[PDB]
Design a protein around this nucleic acid. Structure first.
Lengths: 101, 71, 217, 83, 221, 129, 132, 23
RNA sequence: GGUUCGAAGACGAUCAGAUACCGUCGUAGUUCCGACCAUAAACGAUGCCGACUGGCGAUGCGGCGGCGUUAUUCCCAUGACCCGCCGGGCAGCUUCCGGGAAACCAAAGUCUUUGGGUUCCGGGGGGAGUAUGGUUGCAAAGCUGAAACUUAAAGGAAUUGA
RNA sequence: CCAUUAAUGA
């Protein structure tokens, strides 16, 4: 049966998009179908910030970041536990998870 | 019906004449292939000659050895 | 109510409507509540027409007074704003109050202890009391509702457009409805103002209760 | 519902909604008879006579009940003509 | 044996201050007591079981078969019903089906075809009723015809007193539950179809709850 | 495109009767539509109406009551004699007590009882009950 | 795992509801009180009921309890409901009036009033939360 | 699988055409 | 012209076996031009045109009206924001309008109260998109398209256990 | 990282 209204992707009037290769595997996924994570990353998080703040030359030098837009498919996202299965009454609730932690 | 015109009688008649053939009973009644392939030839009874007697194994769950005759 | 000098709108009623803020509606707009709003303000808050509010209050007071028995009139509130208001309204009228914990099935399940077959339902908020609308869909129960500009009119039967969020406004409209039904039925005349103060019907914040207890002694 | 003789032969006559002009079934358990009271023009109190109205369940579950009650009361003279 | 009243309408029945169930069907009050119909129409009331349907669900310890009873109920004049109840044993299933049927009888309509002399015999107009895919259509019939129908809705119309009716069936009519509920919805919508003979305005009489509102608070709570 | 103006207008008033509007605006104004509305007026299923007559396809506003169950249409215009009209009212009307099948004749646009009175068949237009 | 069950809890609620004056704070007093007022067939169940009575009395001394009907707390609730405050905040000498409300009051019967104060309209139509 | 059943039937059709073309 | 990737194929692993998944390569191909074939889960599994039937928050187009903020500052007027309205374009949310077997659908509704107009297509599942005949193509293949024979099931939605 | 299969009727 028809499981989703937008059929597993985010296409309604386009019809065809360009393919993007996955990051975990090399799966050719449509652009609007792929799970996209704009991963922000402070290059050190807990341990070595205390070491850099006393071993750096410049006083109060801000740490750099590293932005990566990761593209996963359905199999890679569920195998790496990015997205999970939900109940049919909670499938339509497409609110993103919050930023509590 | 699908087309509901005032003078679509030949269209409806030709469409139903083409779509009667897709029924199984109409095709079996109005083509001579099944009537030729019928060994009776559209008959009810036929006399024949016994040539051998065959024990046929039965089907699914109900099993037996039925006694048929090659006529 | 129809071209009658007795049931007109009073200057003190205008002053109390402006002091409570019953005309100050909600931000959004309902498709059924379009014929009770005159003009949208700045900052996107609608103006409920106070004269048509008084007319719908008069019609709901007709619906209350036309019921002969006052004991089988259920007055419902589930939010914390209207519990004291509906309790004191039932104590002043003779109605039966609901103040929190509305059990689903009090109108349909006979084996329950709190089973009642009333004649009139007076609803504080539609979204808070959507469940009495569901029991009134199966038991022939007319519905009076203190609606807002955003409140839908699903399963209601007569509505009074008000501000269902302000604790002063809700209690002031319950006070107006209680004084109107007491002036209609043969208990209290219309010449003298009603003795019991309208601050009795307002729900109090327990922080305000502690502040008044500190200020009293 | 009269026969050739003219006798009322049906076993009941159903109610009719005063808003949509449609009859009410036997298990239409949402149909409501609204009762509007009367106010004397010289006293200002309840009189004793009523104004009855019928609401079928479809108008309630659609959402046009109080608009129809307001229009019927304005037509019968309960609500003032200004409004 | 002595019935204790629970509902207000049942208290009115025990007080005998309503003459029939005609005012109850007029004001559309829900009948939730099985003794009211045994009081009013319980003299000529008849119970006939249509089908005991063995439905079951699969548990971890095999299956659990619980029987589902269908009961056609009604006296032979104007009032019938269809009751459905599934329970563990067939006796309690049939008993609960008779109870729910007494809670949910409907009045049926009989009218005339053409000439209007005598008693009404047929369905007055082409009506229909459905649930699921079973579609049951009721057609007016002339006099002397009979109930030209399947045996189960012929039994329901013989209970209903409609002497002459043509029927039409659409869908998988082997499902006797949906078939009986479809003809039940048809004979219920007979009294819901707007007939042009009902053009007279409805002078609304007083409800009995508003009639006897003092006795209902002086004889009990 | 708009093939049957009469069928479109009667489906519009059928949707208006199914929803429960007191009045409806059907967008074109045809002679068949106006005569059909006057037939429903003289047989008392709808209220009294009015037309808005610009110098185009005009508009029609019909005050509706609940006495109209369903207003249908029979397309195309089939020929109806006096020998088949019993079968027409048998398979189209709900009963022989109420309901009227209109059919246009050269004497005028009229229903089936008036066709039986005047003894004249013609082209069928629709049904209303 | 020391968790009381419903046969302890509902019976203890009925005991405190019917005999609130006889019960107190001390465990070895209200234990014997519950023994004398209620027929409990076993010392273990009696001790469970008495301990839950002491814990509910601690909840009463800390504050209000939802699932109980004490006559003294009901009288205090009725007194706090029937308490009449000082003069109202509805009776004010200055009432802020929006200009469109002033226009609709002018279109009504009472146009010019005594103790109203018309204010300036909120310039700048920014009242919606941004999206996302 | 219907895809390899269709491809098997295409190879079988090629075999039938070759065995007819031999004659 | 062959950078990367990579049908066939070689080699190294795992496996009882791998003539696969994994890795190192690697022909045809993937890139451009001139000629072919017309096949996709070519799907929205929902033909095209027309009329009607709840709203809500948007967004894109063009136009219109109205507090104000900000640039051309040197005002009007044009750019960028705010609130609405107008026609449809992809859409989204609630739902006892209504439909359907249900999932669901503001269309999959206006359907036993059955008729707006119009092209293609289905009559249980296999055999079978097969044989033959005609036709197109360099070929692979494409269009039209059976029958004999065989079976009482095949299938769709939804529920409970496992 | 590897994991193949459980003879027919009831």
């Amino acid at each position: 049966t028809k499981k989703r209204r937008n059929n597993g992707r985010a296409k309604k009037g386009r019809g065809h998009v360009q393919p993007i290769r996955c990051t975990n595997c090399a799966r050719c996924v449509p652009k609007d179908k792929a799970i996209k994570k704009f991963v922000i990353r402070n290059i050190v998080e807990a341990a070595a910030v205390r070491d850099i703040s006393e071993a750096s030359v410049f006083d109060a030098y801000v740490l750099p970041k590293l932005y990566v837009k990761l593209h996963y498919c359905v199999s890679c996202a569920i195998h790496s536990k990015v997205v999970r299965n939900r109940s049919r009454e909670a499938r339509k609730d497409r609110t993103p998870p919050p930023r509590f932690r | 019906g699908k087309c509901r015109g005032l003078r679509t009688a030949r269209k409806l008649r030709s469409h139903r004449r083409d779509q009667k053939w897709h029924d199984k009973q109409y095709k079996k009644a109005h083509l001579g292939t099944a009537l030729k392939a019928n060994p009776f030839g559209g008959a009810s009874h036929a006399k024949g000659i016994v040539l051998e007697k065959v024990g046929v194994e039965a089907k699914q769950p109900n099993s037996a050895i039925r006694k048929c005759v090659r006529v | 109510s129809g071209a009658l000098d007795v049931l007109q709108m009073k200057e003190e009623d205008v002053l109390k409507f402006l002091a409570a803020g019953t005309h100050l509606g909600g931000t959004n707009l309902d498709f059924q509540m379009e014929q009770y709003i005159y003009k949208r303000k700045s900052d996107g808050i609608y103006i409920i027409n106070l004269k048509r509010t008084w007319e719908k209050l008069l019609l709901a007071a007709r619906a209350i007074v036309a019921i002969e028995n006052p004991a089988d009139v259920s007055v419902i509130s589930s939010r914390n704003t209207g519990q004291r208001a509906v309790l004191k309204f039932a104590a002043a009228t003779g109605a039966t109050p609901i103040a929190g914990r509305f059990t689903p099935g009090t109108f349909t399940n006979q084996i329950q202890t709190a089973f009642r077959e009333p004649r009139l339902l007076v609803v504080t908020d539609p979204r808070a009391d959507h469940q009495p609308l569901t029991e009134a869909s199966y038991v022939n129960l007319p519905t009076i509702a203190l609606c807002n500009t955003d409140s839908p009119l699903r399963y209601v039967d007569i509505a009074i457009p008000c501000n269902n969020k302000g604790a002063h406004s809700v209690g002031l409209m319950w006070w107006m409805l209680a004084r109107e039904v007491l002036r209609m039925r043969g208990t209290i005349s219309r010449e003298h103002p009603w003795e019991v103060m309208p601050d009795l019907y307002f729900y109090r914040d327990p922080e305000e209760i502690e502040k008044e207890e500190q200020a009293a002694a | 519902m009269q026969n050739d003789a003219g006798e009322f032969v049906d076993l009941y006559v159903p109610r009719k909604c005063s808003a949509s002009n449609r009859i009410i079934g036997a298990k239409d358990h949402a149909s409501i008879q609204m009762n509007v009271a009367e106010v004397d023009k010289v006293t200002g109190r309840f009189n004793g006579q009523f104004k009855t109205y019928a609401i079928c369940g479809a108008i309630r579950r659609m959402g046009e009940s109080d608009d129809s009650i307001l229009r019927l009361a304005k037509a019968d003279g309960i609500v003032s003509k200004n409004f | 044996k002595e019935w204790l009243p629970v509902t207000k309408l049942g208290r009115l029945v025990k007080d005998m201050k309503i003459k029939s169930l005609e005012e109850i069907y007029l004001f559309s009050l829900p009948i939730k007591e099985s003794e009211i119909i045994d009081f009013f129409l319980g003299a000529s009331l008849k119970d006939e079981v249509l089908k005991i349907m063995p439905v079951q669900k699969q548990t971890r310890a095999g299956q659990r078969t619980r029987f589902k009873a269908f009961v056609a109920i009604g006296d032979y004049n104007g009032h019938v019903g269809l009751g459905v109840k599934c329970s563990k044993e067939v006796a309690t299933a049939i008993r609960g089906a008779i109870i729910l049927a007494k809670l949910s009888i409907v009045p049926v309509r009989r009218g005339y075809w053409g000439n209007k002399i005598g008693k009404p015999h047929t369905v007055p107009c082409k009506v229909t009723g459905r649930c699921g895919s079973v579609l049951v259509r009721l057609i007016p019939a002339p006099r002397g015809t009979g109930i030209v129908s399947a045996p189960v809705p012929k039994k329901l119309l013989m209970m209903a007193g409609i002497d002459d009716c043509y029927t039409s069936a659409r869908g998988c009519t082997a499902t006797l539950g949906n078939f009986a509920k479809a003809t039940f919805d048809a004979i219920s919508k007979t009294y819901s179809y707007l007939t042009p003979d009902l053009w007279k305005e409805t002078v609304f009489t007083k409800s009995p709850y508003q009639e006897f509102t003092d006795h209902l608070v002086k004889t009990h709570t | 495109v708009r093939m049957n103006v009469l069928a479109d207008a009667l489906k519009s008033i059928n949707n208006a009767e199914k929803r429960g509007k007191r009045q409806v605006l059907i967008r074109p104004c045809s002679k068949v539509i106006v005569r059909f509305l006057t037939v429903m007026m003289k047989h008392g299923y709808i209220g009294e109406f009015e037309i808005i007559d610009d110098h185009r396809a005009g508009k029609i506003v019909v005050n509706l009551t609940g006495r109209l169950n369903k207003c249908g249409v029979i397309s195309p215009r089939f020929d109806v004699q006096l020998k088949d009209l019993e079968k027409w009212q048998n398979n189209l009307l709900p009963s022989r007590q109420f309901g009227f099948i209109v059919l246009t004749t050269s004497a005028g646009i009229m229903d089936h009882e008036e066709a039986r009175r005047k003894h004249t068949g013609g082209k069928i237009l629709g049904f209303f009950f | 795992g020391r968790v009381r069950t419903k046969t302890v809890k509902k019976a203890a609620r009925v005991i405190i509801e019917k005999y609130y004056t006889r019960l107190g704070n001390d465990f070895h007093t209200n234990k014997r009180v519950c023994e004398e007022i209620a027929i409990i067939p076993s010392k273990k169940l009696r001790n469970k009921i008495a301990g839950y009575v002491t814990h509910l009395m601690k909840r009463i001394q800390r504050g209000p309890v939802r699932g109980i009907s004490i006559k003294l707390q009901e009288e205090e609730r009725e007194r706090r409901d029937n308490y009449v405050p000082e003069v109202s905040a509805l009776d004010q000498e200055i009432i802020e009036v929006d200009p469109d409300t002033k226009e609709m009051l002018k279109l009504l019967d009472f146009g010019s009033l005594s103790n109203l104060q018309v204010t300036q309209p909120t310039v700048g139509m920014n009242f919606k939360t941004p999206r996302g | 699988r219907a895809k390899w059943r269709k491809k098997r039937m295409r190879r079988l059709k090629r075999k039938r055409r070759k065995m007819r073309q031999r004659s």
